[PDB]
């Protein structure tokens, strides 16, 4: 079955999830000027409201739905469309990730949410969970907390599960290693990968639920 489609059905059949899902799809798809497809501010704000007010079983059910193929499938494209990336994510200019990090750290909430993500999803390859903090739920909470900030992450078009904020390491200068470490915490994080996979499984894991 299409797990992402099943999660969308379950959401529209729940009064709370249906209301707040539409409450962000409308501003994230409503053009308000001839220059921008959306009001990106209101799109991020309503996205933050969705994950704050909708219980995780519905909000994580759509964000962390499992698919067999990570690209080109109907599952995976629906999952990629969860945050309405054409407004919330894709942008004309693609900043350097370290430059984006400086900008995020000047926002009190963005700085707070980014610190929680780096703390709660920290890898530890000695752990059977792959995380330093063997609590997948806290990692999934911290990661989903980034949605609606300038650090909004989304699934990349890859055969595996790989996510990243809208940035890259082009033109990093003498800080190429530091930038690559930053992105790899998103794109190649066994703790985050295990946490996302453990939720999609929908089973009683030792480090989740």
């Amino acid at each position: 079955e299409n797990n992402c489609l099943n999660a969308a059905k379950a959401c529209n059949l729940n009064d709370t999830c249906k209301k707040y899902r539409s409450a962000y799809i409308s501003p994230c798809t409503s053009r308000v000027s001839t220059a921008e497809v959306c009001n990106k501010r209101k799109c991020h704000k309503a996205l933050r409201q969705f994950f704050d007010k909708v219980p995780p079983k519905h909000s994580y059910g759509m964000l962390y739905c499992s698919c067999p193929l990570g690209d080109q499938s109907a599952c995976s494209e629906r999952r990629r469309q969860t945050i309405v990336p054409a407004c919330s994510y894709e942008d004309k200019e693609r900043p350097n990730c370290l430059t984006l990090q400086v900008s995020c750290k000047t926002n009190y909430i963005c700085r707070s949410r980014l610190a929680d993500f780096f703390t709660n999803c920290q890898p530890e390859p000695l752990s059977l969970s792959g995380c330093l903090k063997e609590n997948y739920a806290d990692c999934l909470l911290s990661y989903s907390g980034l949605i609606g900030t300038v650090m909004t992450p989304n699934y990349l078009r890859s055969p595996k599960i790989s996510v990243s904020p809208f940035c890259d390491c082009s033109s990093s200068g003498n800080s190429k290693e530091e930038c690559d470490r930053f992105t790899e915490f998103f794109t190649d994080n066994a703790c985050l990968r295990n946490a996302i996979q453990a939720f999609g499984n929908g089973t009683g894991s030792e480090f989740l639920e």
Binding site: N2, A8, N12, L13, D15, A23, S26
Partner: protein, 98 residues
């Protein structure tokens, strides 16, 4: 009183609405249904008598209707072409005899 006009609901596919969308998403459609004859007036009685009397020629004015007075929240869904759609005032939230 209008106690007969109630709020009912049915679980449907979005395609069951026949609005042209191509999607596998679903929804709960809620509608107002029931009799309103205890909330009718002399006006509604006169209407009923004038229809039977043929005194209004071909006008068939409406008697008290069981109708929504408030609509449910907007619903959104993603179609097969990965485009989002939002429907407004699509489902009833509260009913009344009008």
């Amino acid at each position: 009183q209008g106690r007969g006009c109630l709020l009912k609901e049915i679980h449907l596919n979005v395609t069951d609405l026949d609005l042209g969308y191509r999607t596998k998403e679903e929804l709960i459609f809620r509608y107002c249904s029931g009799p309103c004859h205890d909330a009718e007036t002399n006006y509604d009685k006169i209407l009923n008598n004038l229809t039977h009397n043929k005194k209004l020629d071909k006008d068939t004015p409406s008697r008290t209707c069981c109708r929504p007075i408030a609509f449910d929240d907007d619903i959104s869904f993603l179609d097969d072409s990965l485009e989002y759609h939002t429907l407004k005032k699509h489902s009833a939230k509260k009913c009344a005899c009008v």
